[PDB]
Amino acid sequence: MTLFTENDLLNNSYKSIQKSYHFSENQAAKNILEQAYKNYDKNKIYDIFLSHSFLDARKILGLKNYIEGLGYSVYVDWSKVSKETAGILRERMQSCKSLFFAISENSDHSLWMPWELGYFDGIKQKVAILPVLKSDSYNYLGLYPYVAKGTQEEIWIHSSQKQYVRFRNWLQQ
Template sequence: MAIPQSELLRAGQRRPLLKSQARASLQKTAFLCHSHRDDKLAEGLQALLAEQGVELYIDWKDASMPLQPNRETASRIQHRIKTCDWFLFLATANSMASRWCPWELGYADGQKQPDRIAIVQTSDSTTTHGNEYMQLYRRVDMSSAGELLWVPAGSNQGQFVRTVPFL
């Protein structure tokens, strides 16, 4: 089930968890590919993932990134994509129209195992975004109880994000 953008916005309003307050220590990391126009949605996803023990890297929150995108920006993004456990694509109307997002997804596809890439489908009042990738990659869904699920491509059943093992 696609994650309603309203749920991400609501999650972004919560007080952020301190690392010591998280259910488990944040031992999993994920790079978030998204449009900067979706900053509130990104923060909501970051809050939801932190509750599941996943630290989400968001480039515009990184003070070491250059102010204007350039070759150094691309190199730093490539490094983060390689070093994070997962690559997540936040599918929205904005990310689908972005110039950077397809580049990041293509780079991740060449660097990571397919089971380490997932699409975070979102839905707004009229559309579900990210359908075009569902046969290629895993996805992050929301259960009816509001927990995030890690779902294999082509499947309707997954496991809770907090229980996904890492080798």
Template sequence: MTIAQYDLRNAAARNFFAKNQRSRGYLQKAGFLCHSHKDRELALGLQQWLKEQGMDLYIDWQDASMPESPDATTAARIRTVIRGSDVFLFLATSNSMGSRWCPWELGFADGVMRNEQIAVIATRDASGNHYGNEYLQLYRRIDQAAVGGSLYWYQKGSQSPQTLASF
């Protein structure tokens, strides 16, 4: 089941327990989020949702070392963070599907990470449009549980959910 963008917005509205606490010692996994900057609220919602499940999710515009305008320094920093991440997550929306940076980031991750480390978060908007389905045959996916609202990981082509801990 694709994740409703509405649910990501609701997660963004929840309080962060410590906005600047980014300790890998506390959180089990570190992820890189590939997304469109036009989807800030959705990115924050996913970050909060995954934080509640034990993952620290890197979002580039929260990184004070990033330059104001994208340039070669931006690309170098993104490469470094992707290489240091346990997982690479692609938040599929109409904005990310039309982005110039998102395909570059996904292609870079595909070249330096194992296939099992890459996952797609397919979403649907309020109109019922679905995004990201074309990538689901290539990579793992993250879906929302029908009951309880937790996020689950699925191997490509599998219908058997796994918890974040088993990723």
């Protein structure tokens, strides 16, 4: 098994956005993710609430595309700490079965990160950290298990490199 690459996510972005210019490629992916925010369905039951540290909007998109092409629902968390946006996060985290917080080597933490990781642990108890390496063992980012990749690929939840289980079986526990 292996972990996600910044190469993997950026190439997956070009499955839905153009490969012209960094400025345009950026502006494009932000429109898809804003659209997904406006298209959140209160009556849907999403598999993964996808939260992230600061990442390229292209890389967020390519991560959303990668997980959906694997057969899972993804709501992408899309700026300060308000009573108002705390309410939106509650309603939309309750709409999800699990939470992945993605981190890159350039950004391990975020302003909202520990509150969401704490809140979703309280309501659904299924929280996993998503490591995004630049190039199966990853050691608050050590408080929860981590996500890895496995004729078709699958998502694996790791208490360690030794202890893995299918995401489908990890939700059922």
